[PDB]
Design a protein around this nucleic acid. Structure first.
Lengths: 107, 842, 75, 44
RNA sequence: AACGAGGAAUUCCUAGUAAGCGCAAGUCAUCAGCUUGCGUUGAUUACGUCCCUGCCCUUUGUACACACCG
């Protein structure tokens, strides 16, 4: 990720490797993703692997693989919490813009 | 009050360590225990021997086991002798100047392999821990360290400065590259451990545990798992034991040997390409007489290998090395378990070993004692009498430390010195009683069949007319000295067997120490059972009774001296010490000061009138078996299971402030480099990199980022409040430089956002009342970039939330066999939904 | 500082200014009428009048300029 | 869901979502982890 | 003939407190060389800090949201 900050999600080689990932491998990847998202900091890496899987698999097949309902019920509300925190961050980026507009109001 | 120190040492020819050979054969260097031995082969006399700086036995010397010379290595072109001690200390010596020049300290474990490019003074060492240390000699520190194996180091080869190949008992071979300073290759060598590593520039050999060697091909080929190292050769049965050490030489056909566990050295030879082509096509003839070609692929090992011969030595062997010449005679230096150097010969004409048994030449066994030493004695201020378990009796003169004469009896148990005629008398547990001379012929008399079990003790009156003997066939036999033969005075039985005996030095009483844990005491002229000593709780092992025959001291194997009085037979004082078990205790000839020796490599010197240990002695490391006190001057003699003899003669910035000054330096360098870039724009000097930046190896961005992450999450607000306005401006410029270096952003976006917003919201009024177009543009750029990054993360979050909600919805649609009865649906989903319990207070 | 000790100059709070000024004025009056034929009321009156004059003969005035110049000297 | 203590035996789950194994650890960090579990079980 | 408010060190104290002034008693232990009651008069300067001196406590969220860190 530190590399690929510079619909491509990674190096395209790594992307294709994830798209050729297997079923038991997928369950393991979702499980360790679940942990990484449970922490409130590594959720960026958690989200990158989730979105890469989502963009490169068949959703019906994913759902029909067993256990994914357990791991998805584990995943979802932590991501909603992250979402509302990001909302607060944007709303404070606007105090930064206000300082701009008042400074040029003064000038 | 007289202190004591050791003067010297005897008989340690070559300890459990390596052996090295200087060409003039040539002269030889081996290992004593905290001493290095160097002498000649032609003769057999100690040229020199080297120990540490400070003498042992003082309070200055540490009360500890001395770290034995586990390894030693010689460079004649530098004339240096690197020695290595078992707690892990590396020293270096010379032969002419014979001084210690520089002393390292890098190991916690016993030193195993010591190879140095003294050509470049790069010393590479490995001890019994796992880490291999590269030292630079002239810098007198370790250059660096490689720690990746897990058990210990036993195989080692360094080449150029480039390559390092290691084999370790955690049975794996690894290969480090030293320029990349880390590991490249790893393979599994043998079943359990792997020990022997030997290198020729393409062909490499390792021996493991199953009498089994593997031959390996070495390259510098590109591959990571392959390419470098492959696994060609498999050979079995040098001898059933495991393989321990390999060494490789030539003149020209090449030869190597492997020292096994037992008495056997298996030496092999590798032939050349002509015979390789001969053997290939001849085996191909046997083939025509590719299935059998992969059979050739099996037999490749013995196809190149060729066994030269075996060497079968005496009792055991411990170290071995080469002396080659002329392609006709190949001689070999060897040293054994017990103290023996053995120099061997193989004659040949490239074709045959020319003799089924090589010539076991040049044996050095004189000063060594060649077995486990069993007892000791003194002879009237001039001689010392060591008796060892081959019946090796050796007299020594104290002034010159050399030898006089030699006998043999086999496995003896007890010895004494008789001053009449300077006779020495011995007894063996194969129950026989022998006695021999010094100036007349060897054997004086052999009383065959003393008893029909083991005899155990033997002492003498001051008369010299009566000897006393104790034999574990429940018998104690007294002898008289007929004028020079012997007769049996008396034989007295008991119901338990004799463990030891003694008589009074002033010739009054007689003590017998017995397996029923007791000490009986009779008289010398009556045998009247005057005293009985009880209460040792183990079989009492040794006996002494002082110069006036007033004080008894008794030694039992439950680690306590017990001191007794001949007035009535009461224990004066007990004294627990000597953690393993006491072997032998002896008084001094003059007063109640004594010496105790025990099975834990200690000799303690005590006063009885004060009941204390005045001195504790830490000469050696093995069990102390024999102890002799001198008759008049009183020097101390000790013999120890490592076949060693010893002699002893008498004499703060706060959060906020740290952030501000670090930000100060970082902004200084960044603004300097931007002045540099605009000056290059005018050119169409680089400002010097600061010590802190170039030393911690950081961009200024990660440097300020480090100090922010270091400041903890409860002093942050006080810090950002206490910083003033100019440093606020420098902070904003720092943020804009991060927005240029985007990749440091996305790992610290929350920290950046929280700190930035708090700084501006607090310091708002001054900052908005200012006017600065660079500030306006800085705010504009950081606004745009923050919006891009935050909306990016928000895009990812909401995208994946929606996707997974759809996925879970699809599962519920496909597998949720619904109940149309809505009350049943309520009940089912509620009693099958997730429950979770908490403890409320009512 | 850990041995290399010195005097350093800071500003001062208004309350400390008031308390310091008052304590100095009264202590100057008392030390003026310590051992003299004048009494505290008289010499305090003269000292206060010269103090409001600010004219460099008042005890508190001398001490004040001495204080600020100490601060100046080891600024 | 809080992160549970580790299911399989050769791996260690902490409570902040960094999973480790006993195979990818250097032995000093193995020693550190044992000491941390030691002080945890020392209170508990 | 000593003596003009009592050095070096050292001890204590943040409001009806330091200090000053007296009147009463004399309670089964102590106190008359004194001890304890009661009233009068009533201040200056701190009310912050862990920087020094020392002292302690915690280094495992465990307690159930939100938040914070990890």
């Amino acid at each position: 990720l530190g590399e690929s900050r510079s619909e491509v999600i990674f190096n395209e080689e790594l992307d294709q490797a994830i798209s050729i990932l297997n079923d038991e491998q997928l369950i393991l990847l979702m499980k360790r993703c679940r942990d990484w998202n449970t922490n409130a900091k590594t959720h960026t890496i958690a989200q990158r692997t989730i979105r890469c899987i989502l963009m490169h698999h068949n959703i019906a097949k994913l759902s029909e693989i067993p256990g994914m309902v357990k791991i998805v019920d584990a995943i979802i509300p932590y991501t909603q919490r992250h979402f509302t925190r990001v909302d607060n961050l944007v709303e404070q980026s606007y105090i930064l813009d206000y300082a701009l507009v008042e400074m040029d109001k003064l000038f | 009050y007289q202190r004591f120190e050791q003067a010297a040492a005897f008989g340690v020819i070559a300890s459990n360590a390596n052996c090295v050979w200087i060409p003039a054969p040539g002269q030889l260097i081996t290992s004593a225990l905290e001493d290095v031995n160097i002498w000649d082969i032609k003769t057999g006399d100690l040229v020199s021997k080297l120990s540490d700086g400070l003498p042992p036995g003082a309070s200055d010397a540490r009360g500890a086991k001395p770290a034995e010379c586990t390894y030693l290595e010689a460079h004649k072109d530098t004339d240096l002798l690197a020695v290595g001690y078992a707690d892990g200390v590396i020293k270096v010596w010379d032969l002419m100047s014979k001084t210690v020049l520089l002393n390292f300290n890098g190991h916690k474990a016993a030193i195993t392999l010591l190879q140095f490019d003294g050509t470049g003074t790069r010393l590479i060492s490995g001890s019994k821990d796992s880490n291999i240390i590269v030292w630079d000699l002239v810098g007198e520190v370790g250059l660096y360290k490689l720690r990746s194996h897990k058990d210990s180091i036993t195989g080692f080869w360094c080449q150029g400065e480039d390559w390092l190949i290691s084999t370790s008992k955690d049975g794996m071979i690894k290969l480090w590259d030293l320029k990349t300073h880390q590991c490249i290759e790893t393979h599994i060598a043998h079943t359990g451990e792997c020990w022997g590593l030997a290198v020729k520039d393409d062909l490499l050999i390792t021996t493991g545990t199953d009498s089994q060697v593997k031959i390996w091909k070495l390259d510098i080929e590109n591959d990571k798992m392959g390419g470098k190292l492959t696994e060609m050769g498999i050979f079995e049965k040098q001898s059933k034991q495991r393989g321990l050490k390999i060494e490789f030489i030539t003149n020209k056909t090449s030869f190597f040997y492997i020292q096994n566990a037992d008495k056997t050295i298996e030496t092999f030879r590798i032939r050349k390409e002509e015979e390789i082509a001969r053997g290939l096509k001849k085996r191909e003839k046997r083939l025509k007489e590719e299935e059998i070609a992969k059979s050739i692929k099996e037999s490749y090992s013995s196809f190149i290998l060729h066994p030269f011969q075996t060497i079968r030595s005496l009792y055991k062997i411990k170290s071995a090395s080469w002396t080659t010449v002329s392609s006709s005679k190949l001689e070999l230096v060897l040293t054994t378990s017990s103290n023996t150097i053995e120099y061997y010969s193989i004659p040949y004409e490239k074709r045959d070993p020319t003799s089924p048994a090589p010539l076991k030449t040049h044996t050095i066994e004189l000063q060594g004692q060649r077995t486990d030493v069993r007892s000791i004695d003194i002879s009237d201020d001039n001689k010392l009498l060591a008796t060892a378990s081959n019946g090796s009796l050796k007299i020594w003169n104290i002034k010159t430390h050399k030898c006089i004469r030699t006998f043999e009896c086999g496995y003896a148990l007890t010895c004494k010195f008789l001053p009449g005629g300077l006779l020495v008398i011995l007894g063996t547990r194969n129950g026989e009683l022998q006695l021999f001379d010094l100036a007349s012929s060897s054997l004086l008399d052999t009383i065959e069949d003393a008893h029909d079990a083991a005899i155990w003790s033997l002492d003498l009156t001051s008369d010299g007319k009566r000897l006393v003997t104790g034999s574990a066939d429940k018998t104690v036999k007294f002898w008289d000295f007929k004028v020079l033969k012997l007769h049996h005075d008396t034989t007295l039985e008991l119901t338990d067997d004799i463990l030891c005996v003694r008589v009074s030095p002033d010739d009054r009483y007689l003590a017998i120490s017995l397996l029923d844990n007791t000490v009986k005491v009779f008289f010398l002229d009556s045998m009247k059972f005057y005293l009985s000593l009880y209460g040792h709780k183990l079989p009492v092992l040794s006996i002494d009774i002082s110069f006036d025959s007033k004080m008894i001291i008794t030694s039992s194997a439950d680690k306590n001296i017990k001191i007794w009085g001949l007035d009535f037979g009461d224990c004066h004082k007990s004294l627990f010490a000597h953690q393993d078990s006491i072997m032998n205790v002896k008084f001094l000839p003059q007063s109640h000061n004594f010496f105790s020796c025990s099975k834990d490599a200690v000799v303690k010197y005590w006063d009885g009138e004060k009941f204390e240990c005045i001195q504790k002695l830490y000469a050696h490391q093995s069990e102390v078996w024999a102890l002799a006190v001198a008759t008049d001057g009183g020097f101390v003699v000790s013999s120890s299971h490592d076949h060693s003899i010893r002699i002893w003669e008498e004499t703060s910035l706060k959060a906020g402030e740290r952030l501000m000054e670090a930000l100060d330096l970082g902004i200084a360098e960044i603004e300097g480099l931007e002045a540099y870039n605009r000056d290059m724009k005018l050119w169409q000097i680089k400002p010097q990199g600061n010590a802190v930046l170039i030393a911690v190896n950081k961009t200024p961005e990660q440097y300020i980022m480090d100090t922010l992450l270091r400041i903890r999450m409860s002093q942050l607000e006080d810090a950002l409040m206490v910083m003033p306005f100019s440093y606020v401006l420098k902070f904003l410029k720092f943020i804009d430089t991060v927005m240029q270096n985007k990749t440091l952003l996305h790992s610290h976006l929350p920290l950046i956002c929280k700190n930035l917003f708090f700084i501006i919201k607090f310091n708002h009024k001054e900052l908005v009342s200012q006017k600065n177009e660079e500030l306006k543009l800085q705010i504009n750029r950081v606004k745009t970039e923050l919006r891009s990054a935050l909306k990016s993360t928000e895009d990812d979050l909401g995208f994946n939330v929606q996707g997974l909600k759809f996925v879970k919805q699809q599962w519920n649609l496909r597998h949720n066999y619904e109940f149309v009865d809505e009350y049943d649906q309520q009940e089912k989903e509620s009693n099958s939904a997730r429950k979770r319990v908490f403890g409320t207070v009512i | 500082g850990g041995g290399a000790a010195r005097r350093q100059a800071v500003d001062v709070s208004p309350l400390r200014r008031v308390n310091q000024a008052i304590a100095l004025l009264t202590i100057g009056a008392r030390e003026a009428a310590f051992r003299n034929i004048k009494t505290i009321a008289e010499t305090l009156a003269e000292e206060l009048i010269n103090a409001a004059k600010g004219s460099s003969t008042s005890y508190a005035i001398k001490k004040k300029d001495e204080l600020e110049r100490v601060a100046k000297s080891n600024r | 869901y809080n992160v549970g203590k580790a299911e399989k035996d050769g791996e260690i789950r902490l409570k902040n979502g960094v999973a480790m194994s006993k195979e990818e650890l250097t032995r000093e960090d193995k020693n550190r982890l044992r000491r941390a579990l030691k002080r945890k079980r020392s209170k508990a």
